[PDB]
Amino acid sequence: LDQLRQEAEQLKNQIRDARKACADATLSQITNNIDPVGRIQMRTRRTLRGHLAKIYAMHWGTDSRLLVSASQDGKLIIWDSYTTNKVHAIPLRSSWVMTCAYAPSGNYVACGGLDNICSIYNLKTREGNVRVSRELAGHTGYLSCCRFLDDNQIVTSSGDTTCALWDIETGQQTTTFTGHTGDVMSLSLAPDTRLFVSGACDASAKLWDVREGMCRQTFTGHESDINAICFFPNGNAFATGSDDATCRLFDLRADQELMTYSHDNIICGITSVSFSKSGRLLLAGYDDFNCNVWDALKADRAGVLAGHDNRVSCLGVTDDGMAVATGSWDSFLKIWN
Amino acid sequence: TLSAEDKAAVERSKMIDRNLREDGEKAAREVKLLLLGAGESGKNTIVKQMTGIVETHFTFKDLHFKMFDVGAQRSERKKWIHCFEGVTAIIFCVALSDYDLVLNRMHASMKLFDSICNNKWFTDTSIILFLNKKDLFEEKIKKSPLTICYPEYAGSNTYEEAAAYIQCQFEDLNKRKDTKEIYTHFTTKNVQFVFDAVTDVIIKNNLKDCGLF
């Protein structure tokens, strides 16, 4: 038994040596030449009010106009962000929703939480009302995140330390991803949707192959719980947000940390992260009630989206990069531009 | 300046707002109780008296209570305990027959109670503490002493003194005596006690709002 353990230690040492060999340069040095982004000024274009409790998740539709927000008052609300009109108000079977998703086709929304179930809702019914299409049971812990691949495939992360890929038609988990030793808190599909990455409470992020069903890479830079994870638009990198108050940019090909975004007087955790369309801005939500905008290539804050009276729990950028939505525990979403 | 279909959409949005407000008003009248405790503390019997979270809905003397049994969540409690910030009170269950049981087992119960009571999300949330299996405690204490769990204990082996000692040992874990009250109870009497404690909490919150407290 101990021979396996020492072989594992040797493999970790070899991996570290290879990563160090590939660390000849630092992203900061290479980016020192380019001009920094100015003071990124954004103001609340819209304030989406109507939730009567903490908002825990929000997601944009691929049309960049409709968004769904989940709150623990037991409601999913589909908003028309241009007009602030409530397109739908879906009453949930369990009010402890901690995640929500919008199908890329716009036909379905998903949500889950402490019920350990991911419920898919059919928006495009002929009866004119939204009804639950499928209930995805099989996780033993709370549902932390869920993201559609197609109208029929959804991958979910759970607090039981496993991620699962589901066939919505049958309701069975086609694949189960294991290897995290802590609760999986976030999840992010690659732009091609052939790979996805997940952050866990073990302070490590793991890259998975959707079709092969096994972990390709593991990243362990963070010093604490990872609360959020987002894929860089190119699909060759991803950023993580942790309770240790720092973001960290990892690159799949270089297989190691590239940059860490932190400041001395910001000490709270990070509830969500996201990128702008180019990838120059890395917008992160914090428990100190405001979101910070980071110059992804230069590590320095470019702005602050203050204006929430409580923790900024969720954060998203439209597919066309035209706006940013930030939900909060004060029960208001705000569109910033 | 809106078209006909835009005006109809705005009317739909207003109807949705009205229904949301009605739902929120209805929800406000609900008393939300978080049920916690050790695995074998007797939470099941307490629930009876009234794969993830289990919500129990009961009505007692015109108050509709929602009690959420979250014991099935084996995941990390630190990541979702904030969901229950705002519950009227926490019901905590411990078994008075866990001095010599091990998992020590009462020491685990006190550890969990210390974690829950001094959590930053429950600074002002009142706690209703149920001390279960008092009959089994009465039987067991005659044979095994309380010194096994509390070496510093120096009182008699009678049921009353030992029960009081355990009650104060639990209540002294409260580091914020001023802003939080612990309503200890030895387990229809249970439902009546829950109702009384909840009514007291609600009235004290209202008086705080009105400046009378």
Partner: single-chain antibody
Framework: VQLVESGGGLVQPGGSRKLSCSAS????????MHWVRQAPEKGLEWVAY????????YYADTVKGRFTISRDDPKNTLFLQMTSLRSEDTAMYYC??????????????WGQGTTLTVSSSDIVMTQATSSVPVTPGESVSISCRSS???????????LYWFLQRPGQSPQLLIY???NLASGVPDRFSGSGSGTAFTLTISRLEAEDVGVYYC?????????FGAGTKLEL
């Protein structure tokens, strides 16, 4: 989804009659309801509208005051009290559901219609071609035109296309001049420039023959075209 109307039959001029439609198979409470009538030898003509929740009601000037539209959401029934009936009111009355939100399809489902017999600033929509000879397998196009431009500042061209086959209620083909309705074959396609619009059918089947009605939803007096007929 079924809308079944009743209350037709002979009525002496100046009398009163109540039309009713029974709604089943859909959330009647969340749909706006329209009444549309069709004279035995004329095209469609909007009559009245009642919004979801009965918060808004509109009538055509020809029936305003005389008629009144009401709905019973718990009973899923829609009513139309017609008083002071006149010979001009002889027509088959349809009940049409319409739900209004971003991306919805108003006028998606029509009822089977009830026949009423009376004993003996509006936008104008023009369908110049009354009839067209057509055979299956070919390609056909139907033109349309309006007095006002139907393109709104929000980017929506509020034009609707309906097909009424012999002995059948109109079926929504296109809504807002480009969006194909659910269940319609892809061979149908709509387009327009804001004031002139066209509907095209490719490799049309033998079941595609009928009268094609154009409708505008930009303003309250909703108005239909004369209708273009395709005959085998």
């Amino acid at each position: 989804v079924q809308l079944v109307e009743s209350g037709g039959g002979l009525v002496q001029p100046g009398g009163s009659r109540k039309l009713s439609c029974s709604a089943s198979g859909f959330a009647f409470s969340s749909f706006g309801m329209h009444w549309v009538r069709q004279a035995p030898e004329k095209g469609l003509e909007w009559v009245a509208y009642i919004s979801s929740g009965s918060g808004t009601i509109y009538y055509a000037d020809t029936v305003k005051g005389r008629f009144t539209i009401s709905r019973d959401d718990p009973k899923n029934t829609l009513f139309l009290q017609m008083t002071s009936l006149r010979s001009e009111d002889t027509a088959m009355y349809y009940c049409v559901r319409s739900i209004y939100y971003y991306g919805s399809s108003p006028f998606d489902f029509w009822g089977q219609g009830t026949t009423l017999t009376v004993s003996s600033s509006d936008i104008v929509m023009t369908q110049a071609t009354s009839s067209v000879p057509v055979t299956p397998g070919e390609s056909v196009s139907i033109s349309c035109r309006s007095s006002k431009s139907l393109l709104h500042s929000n980017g929506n061209t509020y034009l609707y296309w309906f097909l009424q086959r012999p002995g059948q209620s109109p079926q929504l083909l296109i809504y807002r001049m480009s969006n194909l309705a659910s269940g319609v074959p892809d061979r149908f396609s709509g387009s327009g420039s804001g004031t002139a619009f066209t509907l095209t059918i490719s490799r049309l089947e033998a079941e595609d023959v009928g009268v094609y009605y154009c409708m505008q939803h930009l303003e309250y007096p909703l108005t239909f075209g004369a209708g273009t007929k395709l005959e085998l």
